[PDB]
Amino acid sequence: GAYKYLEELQRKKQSDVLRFLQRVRVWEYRQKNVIHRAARPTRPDKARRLGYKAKQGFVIYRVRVRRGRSLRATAEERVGRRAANLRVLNSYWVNQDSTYKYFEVILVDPQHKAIRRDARYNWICDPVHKHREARGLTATGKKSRGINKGHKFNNTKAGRRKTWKRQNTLSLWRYRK
Amino acid sequence: MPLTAVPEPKRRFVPSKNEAKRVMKIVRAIREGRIIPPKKLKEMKEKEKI
Amino acid sequence: KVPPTIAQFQYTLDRNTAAETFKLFNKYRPETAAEKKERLTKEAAAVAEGASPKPYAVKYGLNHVVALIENKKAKLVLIANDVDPIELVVFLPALCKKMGVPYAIVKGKARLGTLVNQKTSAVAALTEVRAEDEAALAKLVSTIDANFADKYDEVKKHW
Amino acid sequence: EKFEELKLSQPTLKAIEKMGFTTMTSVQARTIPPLLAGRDVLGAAKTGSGKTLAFLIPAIELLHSLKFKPRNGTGIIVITPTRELALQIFGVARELMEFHSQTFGIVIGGANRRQEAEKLMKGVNMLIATPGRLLDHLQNTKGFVFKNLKALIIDEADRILEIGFEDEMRQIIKILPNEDRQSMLFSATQTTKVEDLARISLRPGPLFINVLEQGYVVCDSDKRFLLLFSFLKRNQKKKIIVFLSSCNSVKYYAELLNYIDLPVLELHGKQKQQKRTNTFFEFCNAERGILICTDVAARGLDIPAVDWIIQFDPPDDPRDYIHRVGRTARGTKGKGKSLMFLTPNELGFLRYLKASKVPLNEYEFPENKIANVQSQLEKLIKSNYYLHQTAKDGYRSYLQAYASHSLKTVYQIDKLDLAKVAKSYGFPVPPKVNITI
Amino acid sequence: SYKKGAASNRTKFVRSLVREIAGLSPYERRLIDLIRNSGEKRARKVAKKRLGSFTRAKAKVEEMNNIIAASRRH
RNA sequence: CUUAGUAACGCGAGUGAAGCGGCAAAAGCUCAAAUUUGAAAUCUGGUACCUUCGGUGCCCGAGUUGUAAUUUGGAGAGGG
RNA sequence: GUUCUUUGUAAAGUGCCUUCGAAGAGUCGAGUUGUUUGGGAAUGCAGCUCUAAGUGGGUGGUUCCAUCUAAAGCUAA
RNA sequence: CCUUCUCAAACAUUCUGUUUGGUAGUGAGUGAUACUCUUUGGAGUUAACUUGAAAUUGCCUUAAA
């Protein structure tokens, strides 16, 4: 499998080959607009493991965001707002610049019959999954919410808002305890 | 020496099974009067076009 | 400039060697959809009313070719020099050299795709060949080696 | 005496009947009752004299007496110097336990460590393992249940000491328990160091029981098989015995020779004992044919009046092979010529041959004349799945045996050309073998 | 342990090929230059500063030394 | 519900949880990662019909920079 | 229940023997600047200089052991 | 980067039997002692074997542009 070689190569992001590729691709991207269509992802190894499939109904977008809300979340929201009909599935980092940071976002078109008839991917068509990035249901959104198993996230296991209602509500029964 | 042994499967040394499945499906379609055999199509077209 | 791994491509085979390689590859064009469909329909018709040897075709899938390499089964590998995700092919030449499988870099992925009935083929490799072309295959392998490894022995150097 | 005169369980009696041996041998007749009684016993019984079954039967009797589940303990542990001996002992144990419901397994150096660890975790009541890998499995494998060691037997202690596993044996003895462990051992002979090892292991006062030109051919690794095939073809109508270092290789060679339309007989431990004896008798009484046998199988087996003795693969016991010719010449009406195949990198064995000082002759063959069946063999392997699998298994077994050879100074995996060996086996691409190179 | 697993030498081969093809990072280049001129006593401090973990710095220094040995000795 | 107005914080004012325990309901799975290579076997769309929340034949295109079989360590895969 | 179809060297499950046997990187982590808690190991979240290994890594109690396998996703009660 | 001199008669016509004719080749190298020959200088025959198609010098215009 060639994917193992690509995954291993991507680790050495400071290598000469990847160093040159970073500058070349960032220079190429800076010419284009902030958000533009991408024919195919430049990091297939990451996309494939992130649920990407080379079939109709899968759309990959490249979005540019100014460097310093997480940047990934902002980019996902920006791409989702423009592509309202599309559904955001995941995103990953591809390149960075002193003035901008570039991320590649994968979107799935629920309207396409191929996705609708695909059992492995028809679940996204459910209306509950509309604007996942807006509600922070993506990988970056969930991470930004501190939703994880462990004492590290006990105080924020189920959000930072429901806790206020839980603690500020005086529970009373028919027969007082 | 190579990297992984991965003992070879029988399918590599055996005729394709997917091709056999497709052939059987086409045979079933022909039997059900669903697919016209190419010879029958040629015979019908020879009478036609004139 | 570019690192040594980059610019390793674009040092393709000469006109005559590339033409000979493509001529040899054109004798093993995999059956297109129509050809396979008509063959299967003919077989079904024969079965309806009532032992072939192993078919020979050029292996071209990037994952399939990479799997073929590192097992020493592949004999000749053709590498496109215009792959937009260059990372998909940067490691192929070095991997082939480490495994000892002869390899060559050809101009254009569309040219590789044409000989395999595909719009664009990243790589094209041969695993098994007919006895008639075995001598031709060996001669082409020797010519490719002489024209690439010795002629372009510095391809892996001088950035 | 006979096996019917012992307190043997019904499944054990049925298995023994299936083996085909009904008359107890002298060593068996002298060792079986004391072993059943549990008394520790050591002796200098020669290899291949039936002692293997002699000390295997008491182990099965003890297992059938305890009737503990496979998850409960590890039962019996057997230590053998060589992988081939381990395979032979495992085959004998499987043949005997066919009727029995207990579990058995192996731990062989150079094999799949993960598979052996999984088998040990599942629970093995009759384990045969070489000391080198046995120590590793005891030390760096959690979940092992060796705490319930009931019996321990050592085979060929002299060879184990000679190889250099004496420290490994001491470590195994230290790690293993000694409360309820009954210790025994057998070997062809016994030296002072072997006696000290027995005293260390054997807890009570142990019971003591007592009872030609060296022709060689220097051929390339790739061409060895073709040369052997040509020799067999041009020597037909005679009787020839071929010695190999792997049962799988013997089986593959026999199958290939049969497929090439030339009768050939096989004699390996993996073969059923009844079938083994039938084939041996048929070869002995045929007066014409070719027999392919393993070193361990023919180590103690009778040697009929055969015209040729070919040592195709390096001997498993160099001293025994060196000393065999002297007795073989006297034991045959017509002095059977001894043939050995030596790789150019294996010329170190000539030093040992000279040290033996026995007469030697260097045979020569012309490279121009050879079977020239390489293309046909390659086509057959690439076309037939069963033959390809058998050839791959034989090549793997041969490589494993070569890597485990005691004579490291003469035989080394690094010096071997894997490509040439694969071509000889018919594989243009050498299949991968997990050899600790 | 039930799933620790081992390299199987395939990951080893792929990692070695990737290390060879990719090259050396500028910090890796500085580390090897210091090793070939100053030594471990000076290279380990820089490795720790760049990484922050002493064990990681030692592992990187060992990897660089192995790479240098494999390169210069051939 | 209980743990509990306890631990903890602030050491004042005050804020303030969680394991275990009992109850209600309980279903586990889907990808990435090793070659189908003796046959891209996958699918979107157009057309003619039918038994139309769709099915078949044909055509075109998407796909080989990976759509079709299996597997997520609870392993898993090739053979007898 | 009534049935019309089944289809093909087609698919699946168990025990035994043999050979193989792959796990998510600008990611953890450290550093630094803000936010959050009544949280003493600011854990958690936010900008950025830096940025690793696979018998490895995280979480803990003790000079070793205990549990899990993060950087992908779905699921009615 | 083109492909290789894929049969002709007389008898017998048991549907194939008898007789005749048509076969001019990659090279190099190694090599087992007989035939004649013309007398000299070697001209043709005679076992066997290696080869990546290997190798250092014998004195007509539409596969148009």
Side-chain angles (χ1 to χ4, degrees):
Chain A
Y3 294 114
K4 192 91 81 168
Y5 296 87
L6 276 86
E7 177 162 293
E8 284 288 358
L9 174 59
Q10 292 278 17
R11 307 305 188 73
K12 270 74 167 175
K13 291 192 169 64
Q14 285 292 319
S15 57
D16 303 314
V17 62
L18 296 202
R19 175 158 277 287
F20 173 73
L21 261 300
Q22 278 177 343
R23 55 170 74 102
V24 174
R25 277 168 185 163
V26 85
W27 172 87
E28 209 286 328
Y29 303 158
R30 215 189 300 95
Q31 311 314 305
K32 301 203 181 182
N33 313 91
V34 189
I35 297 155
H36 66 85
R37 183 68 165 76
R40 57 195 71 226
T42 55
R43 291 196 63 195
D45 54 291
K46 188 81 185 193
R48 185 168 180 75
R49 59 175 58 268
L50 290 179
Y52 181 68
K53 286 280 169 180
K55 74 200 291 188
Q56 293 141 118
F58 282 73
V59 174
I60 293 279
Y61 255 79
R62 203 171 291 137
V63 47
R64 187 170 74 234
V65 289
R66 276 201 315 171
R67 289 202 75 180
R69 192 175 61 210
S70 75
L71 293 168
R72 278 180 68 196
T74 307
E76 286 175 353
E77 180 261 302
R78 273 187 187 183
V79 298
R81 186 146 46 77
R82 176 158 171 196
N85 65 310
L86 272 288
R87 302 285 149 78
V88 178
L89 177 55
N90 217 323
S91 70
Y92 54 95
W93 177 89
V94 293
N95 213 331
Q96 65 190 4
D97 196 303
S98 60
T99 326
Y100 295 104
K101 259 168 73 154
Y102 297 74
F103 303 95
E104 262 189 359
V105 51
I106 178 176
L107 310 98
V108 183
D109 178 24
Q111 311 312 321
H112 211 281
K113 284 284 181 178
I115 308 306
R116 295 165 72 88
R117 271 92 76 78
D118 194 342
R120 295 183 171 79
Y121 287 103
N122 60 356
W123 58 265
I124 200 162
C125 314
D126 195 297
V128 304
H129 292 107
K130 280 159 85 181
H131 285 280
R132 294 173 74 237
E133 79 301 328
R135 293 171 288 151
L137 305 183
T138 60
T140 186
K142 289 175 82 85
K143 197 174 183 168
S144 196
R145 293 159 66 191
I147 289 157
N148 267 303
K149 298 174 169 167
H151 283 180
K152 278 37 174 175
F153 324 87
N154 268 21
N155 284 79
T156 180
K157 221 197 292 185
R160 53 164 268 283
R161 227 84 185 286
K162 186 166 155 285
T163 186
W164 186 94
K165 195 167 182 69
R166 176 262 296 264
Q167 69 208 29
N168 286 268
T169 300
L170 180 62
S171 168
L172 298 173
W173 288 96
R174 295 157 74 210
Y175 304 92
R176 302 289 145 80
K177 312 296 284 174
Chain B
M1 220 158 58
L3 309 191
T4 57
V6 187
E8 310 262 6
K10 282 231 288 282
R11 65 200 175 198
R12 273 176 193 150
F13 298 78
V14 156
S16 180
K17 285 207 175 190
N18 305 289
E19 191 177 71
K21 276 180 181 174
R22 192 153 164 192
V23 172
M24 291 310 312
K25 186 176 77 179
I26 299 157
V27 175
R28 213 181 307 156
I30 291 157
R31 285 201 282 90
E32 290 190 336
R34 207 138 49 72
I35 286 169
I36 307 175
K39 286 180 177 173
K40 279 203 82 174
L41 288 169
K42 288 181 187 181
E43 288 173 43
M44 291 300 296
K45 281 177 174 177
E46 277 186 332
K47 293 173 173 67
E48 294 157 17
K49 312 183 174 176
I50 305 160
Chain C
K1 301 304 303 191
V2 304
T5 186
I6 295 165
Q8 160 163 238
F9 304 85
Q10 102 196 349
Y11 278 113
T12 186
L13 278 36
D14 72 278
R15 190 212 98 263
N16 177 30
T17 309
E20 268 287 291
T21 307
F22 267 60
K23 200 187 281 159
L24 181 63
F25 274 55
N26 285 316
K27 303 183 183 182
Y28 295 90
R29 302 285 204 77
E31 305 110 283
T32 187
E35 275 180 355
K36 198 141 76 73
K37 188 153 163 280
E38 64 174 334
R39 190 171 78 261
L40 296 213
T41 56
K42 284 170 71 63
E43 272 275 34
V47 168
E49 293 95 61
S52 175
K54 166 173 278 185
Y56 296 82
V58 304
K59 318 307 185 187
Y60 59 111
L62 174 56
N63 276 288
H64 188 34
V65 167
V66 168
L68 260 51
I69 312 156
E70 101 196 355
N71 299 116
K72 299 172 76 68
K73 297 183 83 174
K75 301 184 176 181
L76 265 175
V77 176
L78 302 185
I79 301 162
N81 88 310
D82 60 341
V83 176
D84 177 19
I86 316 198
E87 57 257 88
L88 279 163
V89 72
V90 292
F91 71 95
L92 265 164
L95 186 272
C96 287
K97 176 66 74 172
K98 175 52 153 150
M99 297 305 313
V101 176
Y103 73 100
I105 303 168
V106 76
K107 273 172 162 177
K109 65 196 170 198
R111 264 174 67 79
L112 290 177
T114 56
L115 52 76
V116 74
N117 322 315
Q118 291 296 324
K119 284 158 64 177
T120 49
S121 187
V123 287
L126 282 162
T127 296
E128 282 286 5
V129 81
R130 264 93 76 89
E132 49 245 44
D133 290 328
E134 200 278 322
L137 175 56
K139 201 72 65 158
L140 269 82
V141 168
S142 300
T143 310
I144 289 160
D145 296 341
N147 278 332
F148 200 86
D150 298 349
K151 223 171 85 72
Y152 307 120
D153 59 344
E154 63 89 25
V155 74
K156 75 209 175 175
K157 298 196 290 183
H158 309 309
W159 275 54
Chain D
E1 294 188 5
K2 305 194 180 184
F3 296 113
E4 295 94 306
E5 307 184 71
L6 283 160
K7 305 165 283 190
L8 308 185
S9 88
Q10 304 302 328
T12 49
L13 290 164
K14 288 173 179 188
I16 288 155
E17 291 163 12
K18 277 207 82 172
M19 299 316 273
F21 275 95
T22 54
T23 55
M24 302 168 80
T25 68
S26 299
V27 65
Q28 281 164 3
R30 289 178 68 192
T31 55
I32 284 159
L35 288 159
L36 187 65
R39 302 193 292 282
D40 296 37
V41 61
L42 90 171
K46 190 175 174 184
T47 322
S49 60
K51 57 167 171 180
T52 311
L53 186 64
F55 64 68
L56 278 169
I57 289 293
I60 297 162
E61 290 295 324
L62 217 176
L63 291 174
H64 182 76
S65 83
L66 299 180
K67 307 189 186 177
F68 59 87
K69 281 177 181 177
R71 69 94 161 274
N72 204 160
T74 48
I76 321 295
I77 289 170
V78 171
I79 316 194
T80 185
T82 67
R83 155 174 190 285
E84 223 173 329
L85 289 168
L87 279 160
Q88 183 173 61
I89 299 155
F90 167 79
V92 177
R94 183 176 81 253
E95 291 267 75
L96 267 297
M97 298 274 219
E98 182 176 321
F99 285 98
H100 209 53
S101 56
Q102 289 292 0
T103 304
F104 36 92
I106 326 170
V107 155
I108 281 157
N112 193 355
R113 200 176 183 285
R114 214 178 302 177
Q115 189 182 240
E116 295 172 338
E118 286 179 17
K119 283 168 177 179
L120 261 56
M121 285 176 163
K122 285 185 178 177
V124 56
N125 293 349
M126 173 157 282
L127 178 62
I128 308 101
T130 65
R133 217 73 178 288
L134 189 268
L135 257 184
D136 304 349
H137 271 273
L138 268 168
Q139 293 172 326
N140 320 304
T141 63
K142 300 179 179 192
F144 200 22
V145 203
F146 66 93
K147 79 198 177 179
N148 298 93
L149 180 56
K150 296 286 175 179
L152 183 276
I153 70 99
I154 306 302
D155 190 25
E156 308 298 342
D158 294 85
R159 191 75 189 284
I160 300 165
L161 166 67
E162 176 168 328
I163 294 156
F165 302 143
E166 52 174 313
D167 298 329
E168 299 183 4
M169 289 283 287
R170 289 186 190 83
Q171 287 168 97
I172 292 157
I173 290 154
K174 192 183 184 181
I175 288 159
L176 291 174
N178 204 50
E179 290 202 53
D180 299 355
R181 178 261 299 282
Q182 65 193 57
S183 199
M184 296 94 189
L185 61 103
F186 294 95
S187 173
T189 53
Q190 60 187 55
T191 60
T192 53
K193 289 162 187 178
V194 167
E195 287 174 333
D196 301 328
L197 286 163
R199 288 162 180 284
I200 292 154
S201 64
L202 306 183
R203 175 162 136 191
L207 190 273
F208 192 18
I209 277 156
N210 301 279
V211 68
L212 179 60
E213 303 183 343
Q214 259 282 8
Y216 69 97
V217 165
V218 183
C219 188
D220 305 331
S221 44
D222 56 352
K223 296 171 194 158
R224 66 203 287 276
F225 178 49
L226 291 312
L227 196 283
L228 192 279
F229 177 83
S230 304
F231 179 94
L232 263 51
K233 276 227 77 173
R234 67 88 36 69
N235 284 114
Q236 199 153 22
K237 316 208 171 189
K238 286 186 178 187
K239 16 186 171 171
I240 309 178
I241 302 171
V242 189
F243 288 69
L244 282 91
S245 61
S246 36
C247 56
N248 298 339
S249 305
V250 161
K251 185 183 175 174
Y252 145 69
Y253 279 122
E255 192 70 272
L256 184 61
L257 296 161
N258 279 283
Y259 189 92
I260 299 280
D261 315 316
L262 57 146
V264 168
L265 301 176
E266 84 304 330
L267 201 298
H268 49 98
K270 282 192 176 198
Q271 185 61 282
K272 293 192 175 181
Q273 192 65 240
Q274 175 167 341
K275 288 189 172 185
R276 197 276 307 163
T277 309
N278 292 343
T279 51
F280 177 72
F281 180 86
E282 289 152 27
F283 171 70
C284 185
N285 281 261
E287 102 195 357
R288 293 200 336 280
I290 293 136
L291 188 79
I292 315 304
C293 76
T294 43
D295 297 345
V296 299
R299 182 61 50 72
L301 194 60
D302 183 32
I303 300 163
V306 74
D307 300 310
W308 280 94
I309 292 292
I310 311 186
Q311 187 65 39
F312 186 65
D313 298 345
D316 162 85
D317 190 299
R319 290 180 159 72
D320 288 349
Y321 180 60
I322 290 278
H323 294 310
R324 267 282 87 70
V325 301
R327 218 74 215 170
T328 307
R330 293 168 170 74
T332 56
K333 302 168 186 170
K335 274 49 170 167
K337 286 192 172 187
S338 82
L339 177 56
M340 184 173 186
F341 286 67
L342 283 170
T343 313
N345 312 307
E346 287 177 325
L347 262 49
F349 198 80
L350 302 180
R351 197 175 64 220
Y352 283 85
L353 203 292
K354 295 160 179 183
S356 89
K357 308 185 178 182
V358 305
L360 65 103
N361 186 88
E362 190 170 290
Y363 289 80
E364 262 282 23
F365 73 104
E367 299 189 43
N368 306 310
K369 251 181 167 173
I370 194 157
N372 298 289
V373 199
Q374 187 66 20
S375 175
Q376 176 167 16
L377 292 171
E378 286 182 9
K379 288 180 180 189
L380 182 60
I381 278 157
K382 284 181 178 177
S383 56
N384 190 290
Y385 182 85
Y386 166 61
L387 298 173
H388 186 118
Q389 272 206 339
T390 53
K392 192 173 286 200
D393 288 351
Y395 166 70
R396 176 186 288 107
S397 66
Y398 172 81
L399 267 186
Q400 288 170 350
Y402 201 101
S404 76
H405 210 293
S406 63
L407 287 178
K408 286 167 186 177
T409 189
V410 185
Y411 310 113
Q412 297 190 348
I413 292 282
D414 305 52
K415 300 195 179 202
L416 279 177
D417 286 331
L418 298 178
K420 286 169 188 158
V421 178
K423 278 193 173 177
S424 95
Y425 273 84
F427 298 109
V429 167
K432 175 132 186 280
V433 186
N434 291 327
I435 305 302
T436 61
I437 305 173
Chain E
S1 64
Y2 294 119
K3 65 189 81 186
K4 211 152 277 290
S8 70
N9 315 95
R10 190 183 171 225
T11 60
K12 293 186 181 191
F13 180 89
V14 180
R15 288 158 189 168
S16 38
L17 204 290
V18 168
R19 189 75 258 191
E20 173 143 308
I21 272 293
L24 307 168
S25 152
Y27 101 89
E28 278 164 350
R29 185 138 51 247
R30 184 65 173 167
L31 256 293
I32 60 162
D33 293 348
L34 262 293
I35 291 158
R36 294 185 304 93
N37 294 280
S38 200
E40 301 101 87
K41 204 167 176 79
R42 189 68 170 166
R44 281 178 172 158
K45 302 178 74 164
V46 177
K48 195 193 132 291
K49 176 174 282 195
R50 193 70 60 174
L51 303 179
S53 306
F54 177 63
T55 184
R56 298 185 185 193
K58 199 195 288 182
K60 187 57 56 171
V61 168
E62 285 186 348
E63 184 179 343
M64 291 293 112
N65 275 287
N66 276 269
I67 288 153
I68 292 155
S71 167
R72 271 61 171 178
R73 304 177 185 173
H74 287 269

